[PDB]
Each structure stands twice: as structure tokens, then as C-alpha cells.
Amino acid sequence: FESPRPYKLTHQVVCINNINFQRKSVVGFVELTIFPTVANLNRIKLNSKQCRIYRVRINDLEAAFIYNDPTLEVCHSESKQRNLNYFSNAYAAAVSAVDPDAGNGELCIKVPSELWKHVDELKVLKIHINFSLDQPKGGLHFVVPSVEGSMAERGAHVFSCGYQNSTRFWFPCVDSYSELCTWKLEFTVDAAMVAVSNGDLVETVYTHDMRKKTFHYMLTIPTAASNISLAIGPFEILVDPYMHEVTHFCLPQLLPLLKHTTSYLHEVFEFYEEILTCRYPYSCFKTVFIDEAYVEVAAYASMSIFSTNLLHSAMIIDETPLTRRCLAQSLAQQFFGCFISRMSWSDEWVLKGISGYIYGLWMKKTFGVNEYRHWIKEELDKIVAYELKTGGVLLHPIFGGGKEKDNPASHLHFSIKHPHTLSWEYYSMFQCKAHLVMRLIENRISMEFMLQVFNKLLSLASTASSQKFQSHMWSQMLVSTSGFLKSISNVSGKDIQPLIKQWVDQSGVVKFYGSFAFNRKRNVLELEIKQDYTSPGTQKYVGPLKVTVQELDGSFNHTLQIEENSLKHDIPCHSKSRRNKKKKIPLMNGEEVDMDLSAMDADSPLLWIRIDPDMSVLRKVEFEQADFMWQYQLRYERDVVAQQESILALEKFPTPASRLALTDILEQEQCFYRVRMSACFCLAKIANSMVSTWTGPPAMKSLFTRMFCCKSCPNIVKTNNFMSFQSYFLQKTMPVAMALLRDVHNLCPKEVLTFILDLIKYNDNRKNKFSDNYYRAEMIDALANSVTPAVSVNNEVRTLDNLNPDVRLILEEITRFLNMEKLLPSYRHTITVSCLRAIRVLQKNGHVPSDPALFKSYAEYGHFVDIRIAALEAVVDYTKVDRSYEELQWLLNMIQNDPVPYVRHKILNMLTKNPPFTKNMESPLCNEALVDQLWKLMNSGTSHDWRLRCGAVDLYFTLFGLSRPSCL
């Protein structure tokens, strides 16, 4: 109920002064307003890192001073136990001790006996601390254009990126979450450079009248410390026109892009208060764009601060989802980074649950309810793939309190009490399970009741906010798991604690061997199918659910399930669907019109198997039907789910030409976009199975024929084929799958080759108003998917043929586009990115030799992120297959040394996804000194951020996980 944390707190004041751009430092004094809890509260602890304190003071009494950093290495630097398990446990205990959620110490000012007798008298104090941030080496950012003479004035900006509890790394506070306070914030700014934080513009004129300005932001609304952040330098645009108080801040010469970008935001606020039945529970909303991100999402109080990649300025169609997509997260988590708030790290999951689910609800009623369902399927893709890579993603209420473990999910690392142990794979899947468990709460409970719950939540919170600080009666904004659950059951008490102990408290994905049987195959037994499952490693047994079956033209048959899963079950039987030449359509689903006796229709009154098409249980369903039923489901079904899963099932085995026919038929209607993209890849696989069975044509050329008439298109489709965004994605996708079409003589896509080169010829002028950009990019990736591994039979790597022949043509085109985007550049060098992937795939077939120095020259500093990020993916696979020790050393040195966080994040992420030096396959000899430097980088050089050494934990997970590395 209450915090086990003493010394309640009310108010705090910051005052940044003397912010430097040359030695690049910040000075400031903080004051704190504390009601202590018990006497002898002497060694008062706050916490920070990378903070040289200048002085401490309580009421003109500089009291004592304790300053440790056990967030640094092991107490002995050569603790030879250099494996995972000891380090994980030791680091877990270490940073748990760093947390003040116990009697601890990082900043323990000791109360003097004078002030202790005052505590005996009055437990009300003020705390004044002078301190100075240095060059911030893991807490802040000073984005500086490398000019330093004049453009250091106009061209730089300054802010704070960081994770959840990175307020420590900025200015000293508590365990930064779950301490309800209010703030007055004093900001020493340039008169031009505008600084934006939480709260309100409460006191600012041309301030202090000397040379600069100084801002007062007061947040009266009672929040916690991990919401506070200050972006200094941009330009103001109120992008108000519909809702009058919506505030935006961007770097100069980026401004009118916001004029396209920012809008649709009003519609989102309209949506959110259609949900919540409040107002936007604040004064205003503030948004900062920045060339960097520790995290792309980042969302704080009244303010979302995130990257300048999401502008999508009016012509750049493919960020039509993405921009407002991410804007949705930067509102929803906003509210639950506002008000609802975790009582512990082990209490959060409801927060990200309801936040992500709410913007899922947004994605329903904004665009693509079928793309909504598609998004859910990708969620299951991420979750199933990760918890079959790894162990579970569990949502504890449970501690290992008393030095206990209780962690089967310690397949790598700690989770229970701590954010800063986890992987981004883990933290991402945490959010993904959060979405889907809220969908299960839909599955047991009305959406209207969800509105009821959330309105009660925010009513109690906004009531408990904005007052005189009701003393001892204020922490109702900690709305964590237990009382939330209680409020759910107060709205409707159902058996949702089984829902918890299934999904919240048994992190297991469930496959399904629901084995198809066929009764009423003129069978005495009638319409029966068996239930089956067992598959450990990561299994889970979920029993009582139901089953969704479509008849021929009839009932959605739904059938119960049980535990003790060696089961056989029936179907609520269809009629005697006989004389079905006469029973043409006895009402399939509404007025749908279909006739085929093409299936095994002597005695097949069935059409389709399903378990829970609304995707209730975390599933990976394995079964078998007649292939007719799969293909006919692809003739039509009312689920994108069903359509792409029959897409996968028919990507496995078959090749009739009727399959090809029904595929193409599916591609030419109004059905769905991405359905057709995976249908293209169906044609790719099945026409690759057409080597001896080349029965159909050179495929899909006819699809560009019969679907595309510019001016009836006399044999070639060229021009202006946009504004119909079905066709946009479809033309963007199809030639890639055409470049896959290969039959084994030399895999010979020669017609397709020359055809795609012709596609690259016939590109449009400014008649297309839509910046003919990504179309180029995926035509280039089709050329990258012209993978020709087997030209160099003996030695042909080395300028020998000026290697030949069509490879050279592909080289001509990619050389052209690289120099065009060096000259034109169109939008993020996205073309250049696809080019770099293409050039690496050319090295992976030995045509341009395996040399990294190009990619090395695109991993450099002064390029874009995305260029640099793709070069790093490339050189990671280079060091994977080729055995370059030296560039690996370079890579790790740059993991140490570069200013950008997000490259370090993605280096370590896809380094771990795509490893060299793979465990117990050690030919390139990590044991020599590489384990040593890696152990160092786990210990040293990585106190900048948590997640960098979390990635290093992932490195030692993959590379030599649960053991000595076979050194000594």
C-alpha cells in the first residue's frame, strides 16, 4: 500500500547556471523540501553519478558527505571469476545496493547532533547543494556542429537523453521514480536559445537584464523526478490552430516541415479524450525534435523529446504510419509517465500495458483495422520468436526477498527489482506482452468496462493531484498492480487471477498440436478433431478455451477446451450439406458469393480450422488440412490472420499451378496490402520449386502486364502510377519477389534482370508529386536480391573479368545511385543505405572482394545515423564470416569511443543478433586477450549508460555464457 521508504518529500528547485560550450560543463544548486519520517534519520541518502558536488548545506550548516560509486567495477579489479553468473549476481546485488530502496549509501549526508535534536523537535527541512556537472559522460548531450567559431552559437543544442532512471545521471535525487514532488526550475539560457522542461512558463521577461535570459518553469502538478528534461537551443513554433496550446521546438531550417508533420495531433487528443473522458490533464504539451536519441520514443511529463528523423515532410509517403505511429506512443506513455506510476520496477507492466494498448486502440480507429490485426500478428511474431530464442518475459509481483533467487527466467540475468539488468530484446518484448495481456483483459472483460476502470483510475489520480499536499494522504498516484487488479474486480470480479497466473505469472508461449481429424467423412462419429500439445524447452499447458471453425456455408462452430490435454473433441455439427450443386450458396458469411466443387467435396462439409481468431492465447498453431482448404481460404477469408497464415503454410510445401493461379487471383482485387507482399514471396518460393515443373510462365511479368495501364501500357509500364496507395506498396514490393524467381541451371533470372534494369530506366519527373524515392530503394534491393553466389569458380574475385556480366550492370546502377544520392540526396540517404546492403551482399558472393574499407568509410562520424547504422550492420557480418580480428578491435574501440548513443545501442544489438566468435566454435581465438578486454568493457568504460553494459551482458551471454571461457 505505502512506500517502505522514509522521509516524505514535497518540493524541489533547480537552477542551471553557467552552461558551457567550450569546456562544456554545467553548474547548479538544488534545494529540497523534506518531511523526515523517523528520528535518527542521520545518514540521509540521495543518489547521482558523474556529479562532483561543490558543497552541501542544510540551513547554513554544511553537514557531512559520503560519496561512493559501486556502480563501477568489482571491489577487486582482477576478480578472476570472469564468467556470467558471478558477475550478473554481483552486479545485481551491487546496483540494488546503489538503490536507496533499503538502508544504503551513495550520497549520505550525515545529520549533525544539533540538527538531530532539531529532528527530535521538527521534521521539516530544506537542503541546499552546490554541485557541477562536468563534461557529461553518460547523462546529457551537448550536440555540437564541429565548427566552434560561430556556428557553435547558432547550430548547437543541449538536452538530456537517458533511460528511466537517468535523472540520477543528471542531478541528484532519490531512487528517482515514485516520489511525488513539485518543482520550480531556474534556467540560465541564451536569449536566443530556448530551454524546455516540464511545467509552465511561470516567470520570464527579458530576464536579469544583463546579457542572457533565465526561465522559470514551475511544475505545480505533483510528479516524480524521472520526467524532467531540458532541451536548449531550438526554435519556437506553436502549431496550435485547432487546440490553441500545443507547443513545438525544432532546430532552424527545419521549421515548415513541422507544418506538415505536427498536425493530425488534434485528432489524437480528440481520440484520447473520447477514451478517457477528461481533458489532456495538464496545461500544455511540449515536443522537441533533436538530431540524436538515446531512445526514439522518449516521452516525459507534458513533453516528448525525440528524434529529427520523424518529420515526413509532405512528400515522403512511407512515414505515413511511422511518424504519427510514434507520436501515438509519445502521447499514451506520456499519461502513464504522467500520473499512474509504478510502486516498483516489479510493478510496472500495467503501465506499459495500458499505454501501448491505448495506442493500439488508436490504431484501430485511425487507419487499418486490418492493419491493426496485422500489427497484432507482428507482435506475436516478436514474442514467439524471442521466447523461443530465450526464456520467458515474466511480470513479477514476486521478490526473491531475503537473498533468494526464485528465477527460472535467469536464463541470462536478473529481473526482479531492477530495470538496468535487462536487454532491449527483453524490454521490447516486455512491452509486447504488455499489449497482448491487455488484449486478454479485453477477452475476459468489456471495453466499456475498460473505459470504466481507466476513468476511475484517472479520476482518483487527478483528484489526488493539484492540492495543498494532503499530508500522509497523497500517494494515490502510485496505482500499481495489486490495487489496480482490485479495482478491476470491483468493476467486474471474474476469474482473472487465473488470467494472471497463466500469463502475468507464467511467462510461457504455448504451441498447439490441435490435430485435425475428419468425422462425418460419412462417419458414424460426427465432426471430431483431437486436441494435443507437449513441447518443452519452453512450454506451457493452457486448457479451457474454445475453437472457431467455418463450415461450408454455415455456423462459426466454437468448441470448449480442457486441460489433461490428451483430448478428442467434437464440432457442433453442420447440416447434411448434400446436393451442393443445388446448395450453391446457402449463406457462407453474409452475401459473399463463391462456388467451388474443386475441393475433396464428396464428403467435405468442413472449410476451415481456427483456434481463437481474435488471437487470445499466445500461440504458434501447428496442424494440417487439405490444401484445397488453405487455397480456398486464400480465395477469401474475413481474417488477414488467416490469409497470411495460409500464405505461410502454402509457402512450405506445394506446387500446383492452381496454387499460382489462386495466388495471382488473390493479388488482384481490393483485399489488403501486405497480404499481397507476402503473396509475392509465396510466388517466389513456389516458382523456385518450379525447376523441373516450370509449368507456368516466367511469373509475375503478366502481373505487371494485366494490372498496370498508364496509357494502356504498350508492353512496358512507366509513368505516374501513384496516389493509389494499394499500388504504391504493390509496385514497391513485387520486383523483389520477381528477382527471387530462380530455376536451377545457373538460377538464371536473366529476363527478370534486364526487366528490372528497364524499370530503373523509366522513372518519373515531377509529375509524380510524391518523391519517387523508396521505389528506387526496393528496386535496388531487388538487385541486392539478385544473389549470384557461384560465378567465381576458381579465383575470379580480383578485377579478372572485370567480373561478369550482369553483375557489372548491377554495379553500374548502384554506382549511379550512390553518386546521385551523393549529389541529389533524397531523404536520409535511404537509397545509399539499400546500396550499402547491396554491396555487402555482393561481397558475400565474392564478386567485389571482401574488403570493409568502403563500409569502414561509411561508419565514420559525420554522416547520418542510418548510413552509419547500416554500415555497422554490414561490417558486423563482415567480421562474422570473414575473420578480421583488427576491425573487431576497431569496433569495440568505437563502442567505447563515439558520442552517439544509438550507434552503440545498435552495434551491440545486432552484434549480438549476428555474432562472430560463436560459443564453442572458437576458431578465431577469443581466449587470447579478447575475453579480457570484453570483461574490462563490462566493468570499465561503460558507466555512461546502463544499456551499453546490458548489451555487454548480452555479449557474454552469446559468447561463452554460463562458464569459464576455456582460458584457465
Binding site: 532546430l251 527545419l254 515532410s313 557489372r808 553500374e812 554506382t815 553518386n819 551523393k822 536520409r828 559525420g862
Partner: peptide
């Protein structure tokens, strides 16, 4: 220098004002 002389990298100071400019 004959067949494929790709331009090397510039890298310059401010990438975003360039790559995000219609």
C-alpha cells in the same frame, strides 16, 4: 578509375539539415 570510380565519403558537419531537406 575507368570502370567504377565511386565518390568517397564527404562526411560533413551537419547531416540532418542536408538529408532532411526537400
Amino acid at each position: 578509375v575507368s570502370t567504377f570510380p565511386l565518390i568517397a565519403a564527404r562526411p560533413f558537419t551537419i547531416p540532418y539539415l542536408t538529408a532532411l531537406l526537400p
